[PDB]
Design a protein around this ligand. Structure first.
Ligand code: ILE
Ligand code: ILE
Ligand code: ILE
Ligand code: ILE
Ligand code: ILE
Ligand code: ILE
Lengths: 156, 156, 156, 156, 156, 156
């Protein structure tokens, strides 16, 4: 059996070899968006990694922690489904939400907008915004779309 | 009075011009370290921002949220105090803790280690580790000092 | 006296040793702004360098050529005056224009908006937009200010 | 219909999602070469975009502005034709020119040199030099080829 | 025939076009490792380039020079064989060395450790450590593995 | 006293915290230059470190290994003295060599050229080229100077 200090080194190095210990985080942008829009905000990489998060409604989170790697992500199905949206999809509600996010069966009154994140004309991730009561308008789409473009510039 | 959309744009742009809306996070590394050392782990930039966090003992957290900017940080006092430590300070306990972390009245019954984070021989931050019951030993310090070294490689 | 090839090599290398002989250009963004706002657009570094330019009204250009590099720039007075402006100045018209841009003598019926370009809370340049006939509104400011912010992210 | 502000935002974002709205200008280098060679100098990406320009003879420019982006470029013909040259071609004069540059109809007395720009063993671009009266010699080629090689270094 | 200056310019440029005339080196890390492990240390890219080297025992080096690129490297068979090793291989000694390194016939008394270098869960290279007399222990492995991991962070 | 594993980790980390363990080598450019010019070539940072080396005449190397690190450098006297040269110094020979390189007493028949390496208006290092029998001519200087400028661009 490897010595304890070598086993622990190996666990740290697996974490490193996977990620660089270091992740880019758009939590500050997601929070500002969340505040202005009173919304759950997810900044999701194309591979499904949650790079930024703000929860207005903590009970409604679709974030899952990878049991093995501890990395915050969307499910495999959620990850794939958002990539099928190639232009902004606004005000998804109520049963139509299940076409894209099948596990939303208590949350179908919500308005959800999905914004592709593109950098150098490539699909790099997705911005997901969702709230109760009030549909998003075009002013909200301005903010959402330029924020997504900014993420794209920072991940590119 | 500015239109609602211009007011919200200006909020987003304050977040962006400040941070971008981006940050480097060391939560995965802090989690692995916290796991293998059974410790509270804080990766704290030179200016006090908490870039990586793991809480083994959640009630003992010394993180505060900035009112105005929203960021996780140490207090000015804590921020300045950890910069006075220029080499690894291991197993700070019980009343000596108060020199560095004065708000520790109830937890002088812990072992706390402070490790400078250096990159290109410049002080970029500080790694703080704290736990109950067992003092840190030299194997623990190997893990902690190489981890701090890695953080410094990734901020630099 | 050095051979002609060596003299010419030396001149080229002076250019390379200074700059590379490379700069960053925002002409693509300045063109897109200029199109959507029907304006003359200048992206000006803090030191006075015109990094992006679009002319809707070619006759009204304030661009001058640096004697010793042919680099496009603002005059020293224009350069220093725009740095004194620390927030968006919208719809500068007609004679107040002269407080900032003193050589605007047959162009005072123009509307000019001046947007600081900030990155990481630092002043890195300025965006200047000018057009005839129609004042800028708050929607125009949204576009101007988020474009200025993007420049700040790309220079930073 | 999307609101005006949203449509303009979307135009700005297409520019950014594309290019960012940023380029890298070899105008400085082109100018230095243009000066020492008394030449029109074109630094042209593999895809035809004019990244640097100096005009000793302004009437003779082959630059066109893209109808949409307004980006300076060579025609599709000129762009594809320069990629047919895999080694330096010096002193193209006046009937061999029609094979590569067909719309040089009155400029057949000119001496034109085409130098591939190579970097990390890929063809990244082409440097085009042209002047009247004086053929280019091997000293000129030294200057031109190292300059092309440095562009190759700075795109790569 | 090209003038001599041109021909020599073209040789230099072929090196600059290829590599720049630059590599990333890990000699300083290899030297620190070789000192605290009294070992020959090889930092080897997956393609076989020797990026870092320290020789405690100069006569035993396996480094060869590529005739064309000039780069230090391992032989094709050494290169391919270390890539088959997917976990740390500790204390290769005796005849078994020959399964991995077939040219070690005068040197079978040595102990060799082979550590994969991984970066973002991809195989980027290999760390090779070798010495006489003393087997490597677990503390040696800690140092070797975290050093390998840091190479991976720096090549990634 | 700290455990052996901790003391060795601390040595490794001093190397890392310092440089990364990483550095940039100009060995490939130095080899290309020492081949075209049949010369010893040293690419030397402003602080004296040998970044690139080629030896046509191995016995005449002025490289020393740092007593502690073993890092390759010039002596402090050589390091100081090259920075007193602000323009190319060509064909330093025979007793004058000693004003700059005082330890050259068996090597006074050589021709040595010293080229400042400049990048973004700063003195970054020095290129030193040395050979028996033939003085350097202006063509040699072209190659040296442009190669120095390229090192400048790559360190900068
Ligand atoms: C990603 C699906 C939705 C938006 C999420 N469950 C929420 O309501 O926040
Ligand atoms: C930062 C001071 C100490 C470490 C902290 N309160 C803890 O026990 O986690
Ligand atoms: C810089 C001053 C103004 C904006 C400029 N002359 C123009 O009208 O385009
Ligand atoms: C690109 C073709 C030639 C070179 C160009 N029209 C010139 O004379 O400048
Ligand atoms: C790569 C094989 C071994 C390790 C090498 N010959 C040495 O003894 O250093
Ligand atoms: C740096 C001094 C001289 C150049 C060196 N000893 C050589 O002959 O290579």
């Amino acid at each position: 059996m490897a010595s304890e200090v070598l086993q622990k080194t190996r666990k740290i190095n697996k974490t490193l070899q996977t990620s660089g210990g270091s992740s880019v985080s758009f939590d500050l942008l997601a929070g500002a968006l969340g505040d202005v829009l009173s919304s759950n905000v997810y900044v999701v990489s194309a591979k499904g990694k949650v790079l930024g998060l703000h929860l207005n409604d903590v009970q409604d989170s679709s974030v899952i922690e990878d049991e093995y790697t501890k990395q915050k992500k969307f499910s495999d199905e959620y990850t794939q489904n958002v990539l099928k949206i190639d232009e902004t999809l606004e005000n998804l509600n109520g049963e139509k939400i299940l076409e894209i996010f099948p596990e939303e069966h208590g949350r179908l009154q919500k308005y959800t907008t999905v914004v592709p994140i593109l950098g150098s004309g490539q699909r790099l991730g997705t911005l997901v915004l969702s709230r109760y009561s009030n549909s998003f308008n075009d002013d909200d789409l301005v903010i959402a779309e330029y924020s997504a473009t900014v993420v794209g510039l920072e991940i590119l």
